[PDB]
Design a protein around this nucleic acid. Structure first.
Ligand SMILES: [Mg+2]
Ligand SMILES: [Zn+2]
Ligand SMILES: [Zn+2]
Ligand SMILES: [Zn+2]
Lengths: 66, 528, 96, 116, 54, 89, 189, 60
RNA sequence: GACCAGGCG
DNA sequence: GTAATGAACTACTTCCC
DNA sequence: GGGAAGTAGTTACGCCTGGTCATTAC
């Protein structure tokens, strides 16, 4: 019960920004209370699927190879 | 002497149990005669209970406020299908032989699936997954492996209509309706040895009981009647629905007895089935809900158990309590953090029962003499037998003399008592804490200012509730587990939650800044 | 002259503190409370007659195993409403 | 009866006489005007009414018919002391309720063991 | 060594016992409510109740 | 249902309260006796109109009139003075 | 049938008797709960003797009174159907004769009083045989076998036992002596 | 959850009740919500401990 | 007692 | 005088050409 | 078969004020 309350209570003070910047550096990804709802409800497919891909020892410190 | 409930088991009531537990049979579709007495044989019969003062229940004696009520039954003319078990009947029918009662499986498959059902039975999802495979594989087979016999597909149309597709010719087929008097006979022939494969239990859940033959009637206390000041009677929806059902059943029985064409009884049967289906649940799919005289849809058994005002979330989970108070709050920084100010008006209303002993007889006797109108006093005294007596201006001087060991006195609140303080909405566990009482002349609750953050309160019109525990165990639990000073650290992040706020920081900065200096009188006055 | 409502999150807060006896006092003692005669052999609720002060089970002829149980009135109403439909709840008692 | 049983024995009303005489004397020592409640003083009176032969002698007789023949059970031994039978018909009626009936020569032997 | 739940349960049980006729094991100033007497008994370390732990 | 005789303290013999008379909680403004309730025979029921249990004031005016179908009708107003105190917004 | 049986049970001891030793307090409690309340299957409780073993107390929520597991011995008188009743006729009545059998009075029906026709003589409010000239009066000491037994509730008064009285070996001691004289006469012939 | 009442009090009450009635399910009252509904003490906090007393005590 | 409308934190 | 009724969401289940 | 497409189930907690009901044709 303590854990459930400690998770639920702070959500009532959630803020939202939603900049929606056209820059590719800032990927448009849902955030905040909708994201928490998606995670807890175990959504089969998220609204904004995305991946983080790292590079090996080679191609790591170059722009054209990336 | 005193037992406790250890477990609960569920099942389906057989007609024998209904006919045995009932106390009367209802035949007359009326409630009250012209005088006001219940009509014998009606839905308000005395044998099912009494509500109006001045009447006695002949089933168990009793009075209008101490009779729990007793059941009744109605003998249906022809069987009807229970709406709750509608889909299960379809699943059972389309997965069993049409004329022998056996399942559409062979012995090897039966053994293989019994060995699988034996384990993983305590679970829900696995047991449901197992059942679906049996139904899916037995739906396709078109010939019984136990007896050589042809089979036909079955179509189910909501809510309680079953269709059978039969071939008039090779290219010409017609649909046949299965009336309940045939479905019950078909269901009656399934042996109990293969019931666990269908998911039922032979001892207390039998397929032929899903088709009603006798319908129970709830007691009078489950559907009270309110007498309006205008003289007209107000009755619950269940009474109206039962009256309609009884009238329809009587007309159908009379038509059957007197003889009639098939088109008449086969329509009255549908009307009765519709009435019963609406009575059990008024929000069944694909059926016009029953409408009251005022146009509002009626409430029925299914609606009483669901929603935010149902019997589960409305009364069982939360209910109204007795000893409580409510008023506005105002700041008071001169009391310690574990105290609360209580108006003298409230403190003279709520009472804390106390048992007189040898170390508090003097104070209790002094309190009783003050009566119920001076502040330190009592309202009631309880003798050792159990009688409750009200303290009055003509009784205090003699009741205070009879006081002795073993008595109980309901005194007023004093300084030192412990109460529960709550603010809604209760967001986390720190919204309810225990405080020590301190009586004040005015009529608002007084709260220390450093206690505001955990309550998230602000003095602009807010209100708070106050609860008073009554038993010594509850008082001890509140005193040991719910004290304010025990909740300085917040369990969410392991940091202080109760502390300074607003002026408590500005004053500190003004005091401890560079260049601040004070004279003798200021120092002495502030320290005092 | 009504009374305040002890909602569900108040019950959750009381649970989170861990005060079981406080829950028992607030939710049951200060609200509806009653004693019910229960037939131990079959599980149905027994019947008590004031005319001769005899207690017996109506469905089954048992008159020795009758026992007393303390429960909230709302749960008795829930049992009655469940028995209004064809669902049969059976009660299994235990000592202490 | 509470939880159950853990043992069982049978006694003669000759022993019941002194058993109730116990409660008699203890409650008179405690200062009770009615040292035995209703049917308790009655039980005492009925026990002593047929208790000329002493209780310890009744137990000795019980043990004597214990050694005499193996089939004899302490209930029957207490019973024969309790009834004081004198002739064949007496013990025939005594045992006719029970499944077992007393043999006439065993009956003559019980006549000797009964003694006074 | 007592967990706070055990302490609260013991104090409640003793407070209930005192208010029914059980004699007090220590002297107490007059006018004291039974719960305070139980608390005083507990902090004096003379409480006879013990807890069984699996 | 006859209340205490203290409550029927300032009712005129016609059944109406005199104006400008102090009233406390549960005091009776208009005295009315309903016909007996069928089961109690020959026993009229007391159904008087009383001040709310938690209010206090002084009677201001009394009006007697007739409704749209011949029945009598009375309206009574209560005046109460309120001074600022703790908790007022 | 007077009998001693050892029984296990759990005894509640109220706070008042806390200062008293557990053994005698438990004895008193058992007296109260069993001396008046008896069981049909066991007979009628007469006297509780010394309790030998007692356990530590268990405190449950609510009551707050200590509970002790107790094993004790109790002297019980159990009536058994078809048994030789030894007792005196406490009183007689036109529908039957009341026979003291133990903690309860038994009822000997007038149809169960004799093979001979019986009549309720009202001069002394007694029974008298028509042809045997046999009489039954208050205070008479009789022996009779049981035919029917009955027991309703834990109150002792509401019990009845029917005794057969015609069967050989039963009756008032006088006519039993007469039957013995007849047996002697037949054995000497 | 194994308890019928714990699931029934949450959502879709009637479907759960009828399913449990069909299956012949058994509720052991080993949870928290069900005991609150009945009124008997919960096993969560204080209702878990058990304590014993030695009786022959005298005022010292 | 159930509905409808409007407010307070 | 009374007996008589007249908007969003999400996850399943059913198709289906 | 894996794409429609059509059900089926939910949507914060208290408290206050006032107003209306609770059949009709003959
Ligand atoms: Mg605010
Ligand atoms: Zn009744
Ligand atoms: Zn077949
Ligand atoms: Zn029963």
């Amino acid at each position: 019960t303590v854990a459930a309350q400690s998770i639920g209570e702070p959500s009532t003070q959630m803020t939202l920004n939603t900049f929606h910047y056209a820059g590719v550096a800032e990927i448009n990804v849902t955030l905040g209370l909708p994201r928490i709802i998606e995670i807890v409800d175990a959504r089969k497919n998220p609204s904004t699927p995305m991946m983080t891909v790292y590079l090996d020892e080679e191609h790591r410190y170059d722009r054209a190879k990336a | 002497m005193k037992k406790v409930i250890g477990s609960i088991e569920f099942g389906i009531l057989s007609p024998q149990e209904i006919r045995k537990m009932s106390a009367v049979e209802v035949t007359v579709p009326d409630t009250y005669d012209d005088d006001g007495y219940p009509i014998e044989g009606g839905v308000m019969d005395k044998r099912m209970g009494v509500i109006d003062p001045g009447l006695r229940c002949e089933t168990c004696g009793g009075r209008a406020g101490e009779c729990p009520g007793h059941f009744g039954h109605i003998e249906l003319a022809r069987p009807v299908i229970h709406v709750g078990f509608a889909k299960t009947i379809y699943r059972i029918l389309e997965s069993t032989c049409r004329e022998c009662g056996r399942i559409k499986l062979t012995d090897e498959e039966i053994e293989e699936y019994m060995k699988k059902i034996e384990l993983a039975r305590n679970r829900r999802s696995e047991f449901n997954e197992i059942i679906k495979e049996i139904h899916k594989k037995a739906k396709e087979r078109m010939v019984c492996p136990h007896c050589g016999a042809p089979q036909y597909p079955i179509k189910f149309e909501k809510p309680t209509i079953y269709w059978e597709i039969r071939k008039d010719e090779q290219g010409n087929e017609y649909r046949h309706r299965l009336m309940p008097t045939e479905v019950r006979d078909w269901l009656e022939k399934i042996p109990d040895k293969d019931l666990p494969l269908l998911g039922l239990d032979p001892e207390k859940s039998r397929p032929e009981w899903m088709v009603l033959t006798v319908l129970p009637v709830p007691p009078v206390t489950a559907r009270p009647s309110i007498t309006l000041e205008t003289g007209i009677r107000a009755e619950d929806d269940l009474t109206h629905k039962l009256v309609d059902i009884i009238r329809i059943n009587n007309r159908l029985k009379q038509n059957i007895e007197a003889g009639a064409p098939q088109l008449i009884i086969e329509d009255l049967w549908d009307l009765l089935q519709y009435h019963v289906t609406t009575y059990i649940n008024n929000e069944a799919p694909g059926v016009p809900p029953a409408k009251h005289k005022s146009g509002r849809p009626l409430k029925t058994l299914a609606q009483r158990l669901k929603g935010k005002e149902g019997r589960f979330r409305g009364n069982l989970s939360g209910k109204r309590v007795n000893f409580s108070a409510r008023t506005v709050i105002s700041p008071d920084p001169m009391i310690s953090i574990n105290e609360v100010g209580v108006p003298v008006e409230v403190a003279m209303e709520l009472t804390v029962p106390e048992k007189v002993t040898e170390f508090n007889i003097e104070r209790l006797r002094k309190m009783v003499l003050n009566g119920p109108d001076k502040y330190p006093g009592a309202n009631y005294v309880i003798d050792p037998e159990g009688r409750r007596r009200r303290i009055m201006d003509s009784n205090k001087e003699t009741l205070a003399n009879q006081l002795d060991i073993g008595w109980t006195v309901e005194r007023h609140l004093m300084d030192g008592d412990i109460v529960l303080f709550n603010r809604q909405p209760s967001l986390h566990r720190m919204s309810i804490m225990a405080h020590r009482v301190r009586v004040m002349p005015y009529r608002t609750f007084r709260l220390n200012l450093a206690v505001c953050p955990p309550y998230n309160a602000d003095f602009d019109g807010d209100e708070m509730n106050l609860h008073v525990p009554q038993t010594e165990e509850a008082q001890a639990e509140a005193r040991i587990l719910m004290e304010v000073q025990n909740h300085i650290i917040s369990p969410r992040y392991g940091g202080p939650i109760i502390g300074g706020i607003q002026d408590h920081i500005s004053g500190g900065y003004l005091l401890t800044r560079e260049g601040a200096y004070f004279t003798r009188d200021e120092v002495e006055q502030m320290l005092m | 002259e009504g009374g305040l409502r002890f909602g569900e999150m108040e019950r959750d807060v009381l649970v989170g503190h861990g005060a079981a006896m406080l829950l028992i006092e607030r939710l049951l003692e200060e609200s509806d409370k009653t004693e019910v005669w229960v037939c131990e052999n079959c599980g149905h609720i027994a019947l008590e007659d004031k005319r001769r002060r005899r207690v017996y089970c109506p469905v089954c002829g048992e008159e020795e195993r009758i026992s007393k149980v303390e429960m909230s009135y709302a749960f008795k109403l829930l049992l009655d409403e469940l028995k209004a439909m064809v669902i049969r709840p059976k009660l299994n008692l235990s000592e202490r | 009866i509470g939880r159950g049983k853990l043992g069982e024995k049978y006694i003669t009303i000759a022993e019941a006489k002194e058993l109730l005489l116990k409660r008699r004397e203890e409650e008179v020592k405690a200062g009770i005007e009615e040292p035995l409640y209703y049917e308790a003083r009655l039980a005492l009176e009925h026990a002593e009414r047929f208790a000329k032969l002493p209780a310890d002698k009744a137990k000795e007789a019980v043990e004597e018919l214990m050694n005499a023949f193996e089939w004899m059970s302490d209930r029957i031994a207490c019973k024969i002391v309790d009834i004081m039978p004198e002739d064949s018909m007496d013990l025939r009626v005594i045992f006719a309720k029970e499944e077992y009936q007393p043999t006439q020569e065993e009956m003559k032997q019980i006549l000797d063991i009964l003694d006074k | 060594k007592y967990t706070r739940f055990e302490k609260a349960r013991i104090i409640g049980a003793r407070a209930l016992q005192i208010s029914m006729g059980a004699p007090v094991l220590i002297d107490v100033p007059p006018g004291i409510t039974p719960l305070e007497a139980a608390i005083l008994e507990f902090e004096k370390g003379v409480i006879p109740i013990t807890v069984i732990r699996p | 249902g006859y209340r205490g005789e203290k409550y029927y303290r300032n009712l005129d013999e016609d059944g109406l309260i005199f104006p400008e008379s102090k009233v406390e909680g549960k005091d009776v403004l208009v005295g009315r006796t309903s016909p007996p309730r069928f089961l109690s025979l020959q026993e009229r029921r007391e159904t008087s109109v009383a001040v709310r249990p938690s209010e206090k004031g002084v009677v201001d005016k009394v009006i007697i009139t007739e409704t749209g179908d011949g029945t009598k009708l009375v309206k009574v107003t209560v005046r109460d003075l309120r001074i600022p105190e703790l908790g007022d917004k | 049938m007077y009998k001693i049986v050892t029984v296990k049970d759990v005894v509640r001891i109220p706070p008042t008797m806390f200062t008293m030793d557990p053994k005698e307090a438990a004895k008193i409690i058992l007296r109260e709960t069993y001396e008046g309340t008896y069981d049909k299957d066991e007979g009628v409780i007469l006297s509780i003797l010394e309790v030998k073993d007692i356990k530590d107390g268990i405190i449950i929520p609510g009551d707050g009174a200590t509970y002790h597991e107790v094993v004790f011995d109790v002297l019980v008188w159990e009536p058994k159907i078809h048994e030789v009743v030894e007792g005196y006729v406490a009183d007689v009545m036109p529908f039957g004769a009341f026979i003291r059998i133990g903690p309860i009075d038994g009822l000997v029906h007038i149809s169960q009083l004799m093979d001979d026709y019986v009549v309720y003589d009202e001069r002394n409010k007694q029974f008298v045989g028509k042809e045997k000239k046999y009489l039954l009066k208050i205070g008479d000491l009789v022996r009779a076998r049981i035919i029917n037994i009955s027991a309703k509730s834990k109150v002792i008064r509401e019990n009845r036992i029917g005794l057969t009285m015609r069967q050989p070996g039963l009756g008032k001691f006088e006519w039993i002596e007469k039957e013995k004289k007849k047996e002697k006469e037949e054995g000497k012939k | 959850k194994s308890s019928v009442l714990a699931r029934a009090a949450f959502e879709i009450t009637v479907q759960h009740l009828f399913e449990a009635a069909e299956k012949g399910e058994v509720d052991n009252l080993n949870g928290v919500i069900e005991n609150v509904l009945i009124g008997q003490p919960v096993p969560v906090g204080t209702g878990m401990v058990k304590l014993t007393m030695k009786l022959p005590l005298r005022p010292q």
